[model samples]
Target: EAPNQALLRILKETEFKKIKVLGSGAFGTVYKGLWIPEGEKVKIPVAIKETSPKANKEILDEAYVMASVDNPHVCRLLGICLTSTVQLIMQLMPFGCLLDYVREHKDNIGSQYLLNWCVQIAKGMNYLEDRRLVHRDLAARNVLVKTPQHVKITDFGRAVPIKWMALESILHRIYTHQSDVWSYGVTVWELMTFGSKPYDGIPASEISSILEKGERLPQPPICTIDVYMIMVKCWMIDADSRPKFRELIIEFSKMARDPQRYLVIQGDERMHLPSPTDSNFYEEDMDDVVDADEYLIP
Candidate 1:
């Protein structure tokens, strides 16, 4: 079965007027633009990502992937503009990426806000999971913020961030919903640490080795044991053992509602628990951190 091309509108290049550059990465540069749909009196603010001609097919595929979902927590693909160079028109996310937002407001961010964002992300991923779509790259950088209380996952169907990837994803070449869950664990860790990079200061070549030897990211000083356990469960070596996004949404939403109890560290027995790891998983190829500009939208 093919995608419904009629559902994916082919926008006119003339109708989109670029205002300013928002950001750029390996695929393309995004611009803040104004879209005046045919016969429309009002101009719509949009993000235009212009790409190389060679990427036309890939961009269309990405468009089809995005257009298939309509959840509020997932980024919107407004339309596609075809010109000498291809452009993807997307809903403008004014607050930029979640990683930057967390760092910018670190001093004043409350525990409830963090949990809320986690729940929002889980809800979005659950939507994708139900539809059987793999995000491929799920990380703090891949998520965009629309408001203080709302966040949307972006950069769907793209590069595999080595640091954010699951052990099975790296070695077995199997990318399933569980791999996404593993990355979600790291993304939540970034939120807990207020945007600290996962596996920071670790040598690139040693990531798979350490992970193979059962090493995992340390508990963030600000994170409670209850929450850190979710991260541990997600990093389980057996992909099928990971919690589903639906379950995560329920777990995190409940914690968000009673942060006074769930988000506190009471010097509990769980505090001494170790992160889940495996001695059998191993792979030779390794890469460093995700690019800061990978999903820089503003």
Candidate 2:
């Protein structure tokens, strides 16, 4: 259920100055817009997404959900503009998407900063979960880095269901906070891989079969056994078995604050070629890519 503060206020077109294209997809295009409120001295940076007028119900639902949230980690929906095309005014992320940042800058970001992003994302997800709204499309590309150490979740115009959703959500339209946690596990996998594609090349047909056997993505190279263990817990066959975002907020916050509390994996887990045919049966979860299993992102 959405809160009572469903925004219907529209700002003047004269108040907005488009800078450039931020991102674009089939649904809408996000832009960097400069907004100078009535009496504000400096122009505030905002991400203006031109939504399709045909998607009224979807845009409104998304607007209500975003406007209801009030966490610094969650990008705020400043307001809506109904000029030539419907626009969703949101908090601007000066830095680009987190995916590009991690891939481009190898030496700039440290492990602790990466953990900080995970903590921030958990905080945002926790807030949304508390409100009973699931982030059906939580991922690296959808997350924007406000700074090297800070991030906020974005790109939530529509709440449409996507393929490869959580096992339960796939089998049933059952959406809960834990479903989002499952996606978080996949998101963490991306973080560990420095923004590699989630489940890169797995076929959809084999998803449920692999899932039925209680298999999950193998431990990523970047994360230590401890961190990978946390991710494993998120892939539990039962949604209730997964940790809540609140628990992640507390756990990841502590991990970020204490830099040397744990040890990361230091050795390769992969087996080399010329191995026995028996090795074919044991891939150690390396083959799993953006799976058809119920870890849906739309």
Candidate 3:
């Protein structure tokens, strides 16, 4: 659960047996409600995202945005269930967000699962970019898993996750598909670190100073050097220099396809220079990039 439900507000349907509060998200408070559609006999679990009555239209607009995407990697919106407070009926993803999933199952699950998830995210973002939309909030918590080893990017362009917001969004107050790439790099960091918080204990307000000095997230314990190289490119400071989502798909898909590349964990333990089998830590495509470091703010 991402946590926090507002104003003691809930409008749950009758409890046939078990009614659960799945908790809140960027959109609003979410619950595992029991509901039977128009002519159904049996009830089932549904994710109810409710905001205040005042914010209904904006929230509903987001619902329509998702309903149009029609990609497996993006969360599928079943439809608007009610209009009183505005609740969205969506496919129940039982496992919760990827951050929660990795935290609870980091040790129980294998590293390849994380790699596969990274690829799925790329596929989703690639879909979003192809459609000219940006996921301003891209983080482990923003992604949802429908089944074991299956993931979907959730909570589209709703709001910015400043905790995971890219430097461009933070400093300039701008957002584009490129900003999503920077956040995607951070999501890769989350996958590699088994859902560890970005910047560990660093304050979001002070990240500007940290990234000003060419600092980046340290290598995660389970991330292979090859994939970390891709993450670094995602964090490129110059917006134009950052690789396109289409390129990311091609590169990550190649990495995910080669099972041998992920069979063993290869992240750096010395906190020193990171290594990669087929690339350098900096600039194979560094011709267009400048000081290029603050993009690591997430």
In terms of TM-score, which candidate is strongest?
A: 1
Q: Please give each candidate's TM-score.
A: 0.83, 0.80, 0.75
In model 1, how large is the Cα lDDT of residue 254?
85
Ranked by TM-score, the better of candidates 1 and 2 is 1
**Candidate No. with top lDDT:** 1
- Where in model 3 is the C-alpha error above 4 Å? 1-19, 24-28, 33-45, 51-53, 157-160, 263-298
Give residue 58's error in model 2 in angstroms. 3.2
Of candidates 3 and 2, the better by TM-score: 2
Of 2 and 3, the candidate ahead on lDDT is 2
User: What would the per-residue lDDT of candidate 1 be over residues 1-298, giving only the tens digit for each residue?
Assistant: 6654536768888887898989988766889766766764546667898845557878878888876777878986878877877778887776789999889877667677788899999999999887778988998998997657668999884624788989987887888999999999999989888899888888666778888999998898867789989999999999888899999999998898877565543433222211124343111222221211223222
- Cα lDDT computed for each candidate against the true fold: 0.78, 0.69, 0.68
What is the full ranking by TM-score, best candidate first?
1, 2, 3
Residues forming the 10-long window of minimal summed lDDT in candidate 2: 289-298
By lDDT, rank the candidates, best first. Answer: 1, 2, 3
> Which stretch of 10 consecutive residues in model 3 shows the poorest summed lDDT?
289-298
Clash count, predicted structure 1 = 0
Collision pairs in model 2: 165-294, 165-295, 165-296, 166-294, 166-295, 166-296, 167-294, 199-289, 199-290, 200-290
For residues 241-275, what per-residue lDDT tens digits would candidate 3 score against the true structure?
88888888777777767744653544322222122
